[PDB]
């Protein structure tokens, strides 16, 4: 349970980073 | 009608020969002489039969020497063994007839010549009974005295032939203390007492490799993002 | 008293005996000689070294006394007790020795990009 | 014994196995599957196979001064490359292979739309 | 062979084990100490009458046939000079004999229980290292008729073991015997028996003396080692796509 | 006179007949009974110099023993094929990431 | 073993980057 | 000659001795006789259920009846560590999902490239 | 009393149950059909010798003492005219007798099993209302020595029940008997026995034949009392909404 | 030395008296005459002893009449019972002596006078064996014929005295069908077949309160509907 | 002389020694044996006047008994807190319902 | 003969004895007096009444004979048999006595609305 | 108890009202 | 079963009454 | 008895319980939880608690002329306010709380649409 | 002093006597001994399953071993009537669903009022 949480913490962190890069870059 | 055997006991060693004598006496004209042996469990076994009209009867390891002019008949047991220790009877002798036996001679067979070995005694108790046990030894000159200040009974030793061709002996004795008793032996000019016998490195690499693949994937996402951004400007 | 620095690298275990640096040394192991015996050529002494290869946790794990020439073996007032899970191509590395490689990887990946950016004049 | 001489020594602190040819001779000559894959000098008696974590299979034998011994097929499934296919790995394999394909396809849509 | 221990002025039954089909005469012999086996009588079986010796009147020996081809010699008015071993015999030539039956005639001088009483022994502790073996010892005592047979058997088998008896030594009015056995190394901690056959053994059945002797972390590191190696062969496919789409502008 | 280092299931003890005086190293704990010392866990790597005094047979002799342990469970098996195949592609990924930064500016 | 503490060293790095772009995106959206 | 074939399905081990097709054979394990009725001694199969490592790992000898086990062909040495409903990725399932993953990724992104350029 | 069924030219053992301490002479009588009891012989016990009658030579009758104060008369070379009842007697005056022992001397004309074979019966169904009772019937057959004793016992008791036997009728070469018992009303459905004593029974032990005989409405009124009190605090919320939306127009 | 009893059998009913005769003959001067009885289970019981020098010996219900001038002696059994059915022996007769017996007379005791009763027969089967059972009846004139067309065996009836002083009889018979067989009796001029024998104060308030809440809810729906309709006009 | 009113599990009988002649009330049933009457169930509330005649001890005296029962299972426990909290809000609901009818016309 | 009207209201049970309205009455209960005993002041007689409070089904359920002055108790030719499950604040009410409240509630709710409607001129 | 017959006295009132509005709605829809 | 039917008979009667009031009133 | 005097009389036709202090005295003084919550005169012996349908709990005791008695914690779960939460009440609670909210919301939609 | 705590879960009653923490205690019910092995006598718990009213309702006495039950602290009187998988609505679940029903109705009709005025 505790080793498995870090492998779906990085998933929501990858998807949140990609979404907030793609939506930040729409400024031009 | 008499059968005489004036031989009390004989002692002959293994793979030798022995002659037993039997003086019969009768007035018949045709008779038979039978030989029987008696085990210590009281069993009579027919050995050999000498008919007094034809020549000497032999059957295996038994042979009969017949003196018809005299009154002597003689049994030969050649190539002796260890179960030739019995008592042997001479008998003299249609379904109604009787056998006239002699008083019987005893044959006690002794083992062969062996080099001398040493006793190696032990001891075993049952609260008040002790028993000195003597292991194999060839010449029968044994003295199995025990040591106790408090003596009640002491039976004689029982020397018997082992299947190795040597001798074993047990000497019982009842005492009170029965715990500080140690037997001794005076066999073959050298005394034997009984006190000398009395005394997680690949799990770490797998986590390191998975962390390395994480740090590669977070750069192969970055290269793809940076080039797809370049495609739009 | 001065220790016996036990350097364990891979399989090779090197003990140093600096207690007599002005003499010629030997070793022992459970009151039995080792080193300077000129057989089983992996082991071998020096001015202070002793290098044991094909080391095992089972055997060669006990009292390693190092005494100079002309010395009775029970004269020394120091012993070792070495018990080691000597391994094949593995080294001790905790958590703090991996974050210091991750941070250096970040500062050598992210220290190149603002230099490639400054090259472009 | 009955011409069954090879044994395997185990149950120690480290992960290694050792074929012990219990046959009195000098210069025991090891084999594997009919061929002479190894050899030995004196001062060492137990041939080494490696780690149990690397799964030593085969059919090993030895030979003394007398006639050759009978084999012993070693089988080691100390796997360590096992993955657990319960209902939380095959259902977390349809989430790294659906999100990734849809991110790649929402990228490729824009790539081809730019052309 | 067994024993019979009747008192004086009594009757004694002596049966013989010699089983023969279609006999004609059954002879009866008596053997005493230091004398010869003499015939007492013989029993006609086609006419059922005893033919005695030249020494005693009738009314002493009687041959009884309880079943067909089974014979018992009944003695009557026992005197102390009647004691010895009694055989039965038949012709065929040779003359077969019948294993003996000791008869003891006492003056009722027992006055207690005279069953053999064991006092068994155990091997020493020092014998059981420096010899790879151990020895038992089975001393019996206080039994009167002295026709006793000690033999050793296994825990569960029908083998007779190599025992080594002793002489039936005599106490003040009772007797005493001991037998002992040596057993080898790898048959040592099992059970052994000291079966003792005797006449005054309770319930008729002979005695039988028994002798003592993490896998959770390992799977969740390689189930996520293979996912990141399958998200790394999609980023290379996408890198090939964008490189092929960027190189067509140069 | 050595100092016996006896073993429970995980306690690497230090035994004597006279009072253990610690010199230098991992003190472990104390122990309530005299002429003893506890060093604690096997996987802790206890190491230290502990001089002791004589016994009832070998008296008037101050003895000394160092204890040293390398029972590693913090160790990692570094391979020459999955380290040199992670570094040599991470340099490739870094040199690819330093291509687009050129490609903009 | 050192696996459970080691895995979160990347997810304290992606949190830094995620909060950096949320702090950069909130600035270039309202102002 | 012909070795013992062992096959481990899930947590259940099952092994065969293909030296004698039809006979009455027995099985042993450190001279603890296995066969005759838990555990299963088939005509040439042995089905070791609940294969825990610390009680069933040793010397298995397959031989027909009437024969001494030490006069047989050879032995086995088994040190299996099994799990519940798990696989073991050799290079037959790691060179198959890698092939079909690229031939399903390139077989979908090309379809999106068609659908997007129209 | 029992029977003995020896063949011709055989031997027969006839023991008597008359137990007497310190006897001196034991007489032996013979009774045949339609004749008188005559003495055959008498046995001196202080001298152990038989004194016979004026009719036959010795070699026919023998008195055997197996134990002290127990006597067996052994007959020898049995002829068919030896069959009858044999008593033993002692003086005190009166002369006590010894319960008899029938001896049957046949020419081995049995050639099969001659044990008594029951074919038991059950009471009728009409007897068990209009009589308050029921009757059993225990027919035996095919048994040779004809000294048989049938008596009935309870399920668990030591009482002898009032049975009523019949005559031992003779078949062509075997015999046949039947006994029957009537039991009253309240001891009817229990177990009963038909114990049969005979010589040619299996294993010597005599036979033993066994004879058969609302909290539902309370919950659905308050599970709907709380629903209507929760649809009545939504209508007040909606009434507050429409009142607040109507009062802003006034 | 002779003892003569010229009486084969006697029949005498219950509580009557009977004299048995015994003609002895001897040449002694002092003798004894013993009387014995023999049960059908073959047991001899001493009854009475008449010493030939003093007067008549009586013991309980036995009495002996002695004619010393003649050779006649006579036993009287007064007040007879049901277990006086034996065979009686006269014997003539210090520890060595023998008894000289006579051939023996048999006494069979008949029951008393009873009024006549009726049979009331039954029947019981075992597959092939049948058995007609006849209950108590006083005069012994019985005929227990059975009815079957298929007859194999038919033994004789066994008439025995009941403990009530009347008679019971069983007549076995083996047949094939053994199910349609019915016995009959011709006792005492009247035939007897065997076919005549063959044939709650708070539940109410809770329902009232729930009805009250229903009538409130159907008005709070009406008020809300009426005001929401007012909002639209 | 009273008239005994005996009880089965649910039958409230009326027993006499001479013929029961019903006067006035719940007749129940009859009964086949004379000098009896069945009134039926306990929860039926049987009530009535039933004159009877004398017995073998207290003859020449006509006796009379009324039977009366109030074993209610048709009764309801009226509370002064859930009746006066249903009426006083139903008057409120009626006066609210008579507000909108004003509010239209 | 005239009955004994048993009015049971709540817990109070009032029996009326109109057989002698021109005399002074008493009561009895199992040939034992009750009423006119001037103790346990809940019970109490009148010209014909008898009011029993704290009534129970268990006790006080039997023969209530009411006889005038100068009368032997076994002279009266009438008895009661009262067995009552006297209850606390509960009354007998069948189904038909509730529909007649529902219909009256409908005709007094729906008889106001067409009057409020007629008020609005 | 009087619960089962008592509950349907409201659902014979709502049926009256429901058939009244269906009879009023069918009139103002067709005609 | 029989006490429960009257509590879902009134439900379909409430909903049918409300629906056929709301649909009748759409005449203006 | 052993200083255990209070009993409770039950099993009658009506729903009430009665504490019977089996202790010989005059003027027994009832209690509840250490305090003198009641009192009694003569002519009555069993104190009344009310209905079993109203669940009388507590710890009751009494006191005679001798020393005070030991308590008796009465516990009555004659509940009657129990509802049966099977699969036909919690599934008929999601039908009076979904239809009602949707009727109220389709009303409030039109109310706010009129504004 | 400290009364017996009784707790009724579903149809199963379970009651505790918190006067002696650690000892060997027994239980009784109208002097019919309950304890020693259906029913469960724990170290301080009694678990009366299938609690039907007409056979288990009376005098429960908790006391350690060696002591007389009449020399104990006090008794209980239990008259529970239990049902299968049911609750008992005190004012903890009838003042909670009434609060959250209004704070879920006003927390939804206000959202519909927002969604409809736009």
Numbering used by the authors:
A (entry chain b), N (entry chain B): 27 to 54
B (entry chain m), J (entry chain M): 22 to 114, 119 to 224, 256 to 289
C (entry chain e), L (entry chain E): 33 to 153
D (entry chain g), O (entry chain G): 26 to 140
E (entry chain n), I (entry chain N): 11 to 102, 111 to 231, 252 to 288
F (entry chain d), K (entry chain D): 22 to 126
G (entry chain a), M (entry chain A): 26 to 56
H (entry chain f), P (entry chain F): 33 to 69, 74 to 154
Quote the study's own text.
The Vγ5Vδ1 TCR–CD3 complex displays a dimeric architecture, whereby two protomers nestle back to back through the Vγ5 domains of the TCR extracellular domains. Initially, we obtained a nominal 9.5-Å-resolution cryo-EM reconstruction after several cycles of classification and refinement, which enabled us to identify two protomers, denoted I and II. Each protomer consists of an ECD, a membrane-proximal domain (MPD) and a TM domain (TMD) (Fig. 1b (left)). Although the cryo-EM densities for the MPDI–TMDI and MPDII–TMDII were less well resolved, we were able to dock the Vγ9Vδ2 TCR–CD3 structure into the cryo-EM densities based on clear secondary structural elements. The Vγ5Vδ1 TCR–CD3 complex displays a dimeric assembly, comprising two protomers nestled back-to-back through their ECDs, with each MPD and TMD independently embedded in the membrane. In each protomer, the ECD and MPD–TMD are connected by unresolved TCRγ5 and TCRδ1 CPs. Underneath the ECDs, the two TMDs are separated by about 75 Å and appear to have no direct interactions. Notably, in protomer II, the Cγ5 and Cδ1 domains are aligned vertically with the TMD, whereas, in protomer I, the Cγ5 and Cδ1 domains laterally deviate from the TMD by about 45 Å. MPDI–TMDI and MPDII–TMDII are arranged asymmetrically, with CD3ζIIζ′II facing CD3εI. Our current model suggests that MPDI–TMDI and MPDII–TMDII are positioned at an angle of around 60° relative to each other.
